[PDB]
Amino acid sequence: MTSPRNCLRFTLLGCGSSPGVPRINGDWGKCDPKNPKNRRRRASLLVERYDAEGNNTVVVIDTGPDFRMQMIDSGVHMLDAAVYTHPHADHIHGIDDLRTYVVDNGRLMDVYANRLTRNRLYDTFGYCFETPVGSSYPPILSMHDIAPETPFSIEGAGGAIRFEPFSQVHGDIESLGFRIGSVVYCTDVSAFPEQSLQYIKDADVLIIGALQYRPHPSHFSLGEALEWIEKLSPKRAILTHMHVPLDYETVMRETPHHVEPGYDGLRFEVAV
Amino acid sequence: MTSPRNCLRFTLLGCGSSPGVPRINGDWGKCDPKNPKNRRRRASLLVERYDAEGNNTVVVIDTGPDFRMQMIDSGVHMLDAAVYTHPHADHIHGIDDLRTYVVDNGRLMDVYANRLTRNRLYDTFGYCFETPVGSSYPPILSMHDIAPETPFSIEGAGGAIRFEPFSQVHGDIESLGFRIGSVVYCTDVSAFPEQSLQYIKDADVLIIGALQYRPHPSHFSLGEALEWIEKLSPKRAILTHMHVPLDYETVMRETPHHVEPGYDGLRFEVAV
Ligand SMILES: Nc1ncnc2c1ncn2[C@@H]1O[C@H](COP(=O)(O)O)[C@@H](O)[C@H]1O
Ligand SMILES: Nc1ncnc2c1ncn2[C@@H]1O[C@H](COP(=O)(O)O)[C@@H](O)[C@H]1O
Ligand SMILES: [K+]
Ligand SMILES: [K+]
Ligand SMILES: [Mn+2]
Ligand SMILES: [Mn+2]
Ligand SMILES: [Mn+2]
Ligand SMILES: [Mn+2]
């Protein structure tokens, strides 16, 4: 058997900070421009469940500006739902590209967001939900609420994928993290509230944001992320949302064996 | 002399329709997937003026979702201004990526838009103009009005670039086209008003949208674009905003010698 079966499969679609690596002006920072692993798209995760016959349920976490190229390069040509962490540009400005799937599926695309995120999507992308005055474009999205500490499930051809959302502090706003089975996704986080600890401890894989070496008001530094990894004892940790000071080979050396920097297209399967 | 001097230089950053080619679901339509010229980013044009010493003024027309990769691949690492045609997703959803230049230039990025476009950018990207409640992010953009039949000039290190905007019908809304010297850029157009004809006739290069073979309410078909090219007698025409029915090699054969389909990265210099 040479295709995925009886598993969850995770693909790190993007592992960069908000301006990407390099920045738009060609700035690679301290990254080796010759290592393709240092070319970073904006942060996003693809989550799939495969059954015994290889049928799949497919869910994306965040639709940033790189969403179209991320999906094309993933090789996965269908989508059941999108789930959002928070309403920052690098996580939402690719939303229009969900249109194609609406035509393929013959129904509105199910999207999942908390109230803060939803209310900002309605402000800035209202035409995706309701046809405005002077337009003939039908809406393309169907909104579902999510909230910390309330699990939700997304159905599809591979069976249901159950998400456990939890609260994160992200500078001056809240973002969501998610546990999916044994795998935890924590991007855009500067502190973990006490009530969220149960969701983040004892993960088989912890995917955790580490922006740079120096402190930043909205994200963990590398040292802060490593302190959390030591406390939470994941079997493996993968760093994400990495900015131009963090070079792949350098960070690989500086971190424990069970910890690695992410790279775009990083893919693994786990039991379900 | 092996770098540009004493010229205008134009780069077709993107030549695709709104979902790109291929679509996000991997659909190439009738395009040969093996020809790299058929991989199309969303429509945008880079305009540069170089002086005798190779100093440049750099202006982008539209900042769609592909804007960051377009600029990186262009090799041009600075920007003086952005000019907008109309407020559709494929032309504006990359706007946040102007942030990097604001830091480099030490001043807000000058953006140019008509009232319709400006009012939609304020709705959907207000935080780029004014810090909202609960935020510490400074604004990044400085807005300037443009209107059909009123020329405007953008200053920079290579000298001024003079734009002549004009009205286009684009289905149920108006879009702007621009003449820059001898070069005319007409994307997202389904009809030309009589008063715009003076700007589009007798171009050295006419860059004109041709979506597909079949009629569409918002864009010229290939046949309609060719009818206009015959009436307007440009020396050379380049087709843009091309959707998945239009294969590069096929359209090259079907069109007169002085007419060609565009491709991403297409670049030419003209006298100033
Ligand atoms: N009010 C806002 N709405 C959406 N995006 C914002 C807002 N304010 C700032 N941003 C952008 O959100 C991103 C913040 O990046 P991060 O450091 O990854 O939390 C940057 O792309 C900012 O330019
Ligand atoms: N009210 C709106 N604001 C912004 N973009 C829109 C709106 N309505 C539709 N669109 C998108 O704008 C694009 C229209 O594409 P075009 O066929 O190139 O004119 C598509 O990406 C649409 O999903
Ligand atoms: K390591
Ligand atoms: K031809
Ligand atoms: Mn972010
Ligand atoms: Mn953020
Ligand atoms: Mn368009
Ligand atoms: Mn349009």
Residue numbers in the entry:
A (entry chain A), B (entry chain A): 1 to 272
Please give me the paper's original passages concerning this structure.
Here, we report the high-resolution structure of BrabA.11339.a, a structural genomics target that entered the pipeline as a ‘β-lactamase-like protein’. β-Lactamases break down β-lactam antibiotics such as penicillin and lead to the resistance of pathogens to antibiotics. BrabA.11339.a assumes a metallo-β-lactamase-like fold with two central β-sheets. As a very typical feature of β-lactamase-like proteins and the phosphodiesterase protein family, a two-metal center is present in the active site of BrabA.11339.a. It therefore seems likely that BrabA.11339.a is a GTP/ATP or GDP/ADP hydrolase.
In order to analyze the metal center in more detail, diffraction data sets with high multiplicity were collected at long X-ray wavelengths from the ligand co-crystals: in-house at λ = 1.5418 Å and at the synchrotron at λ = 1.3476 Å. For both long-wavelength data sets and the Se-edge data set strong anomalous Fourier peaks can be observed for the two active-site metals. Each of the peaks is about four times as strong as the signal for potassium. The anomalous signal for Ni2+ is strong at the Se edge and at 1.3476 Å; however, it is low at 1.5418 Å. Manganese is the only metal in question that has a significant anomalous signal at all three wavelengths. Therefore, the dinuclear center of BrabA.11339.a can be assigned as two manganese ions with a high degree of confidence. In order to confirm the binding of nucleotides, crystals were grown in the presence of GMPPNP and AMPPNP. In both cases, however, very solid electron density could be observed for GMP and AMP, respectively. The γ-­phosphate groups of GMPPNP or AMPPNP, which had been added during crystal growth and had been supplemented for a short soak in the cryobuffer, are nonhydrolyzable; the β-phosphate groups, however, can be hydrolyzed. It can be assumed that BrabA.11339.a is able to hydrolyze AMPPNP and GMPPNP between the α-phosphate and the β-phosphate to AMP or GMP, respectively.
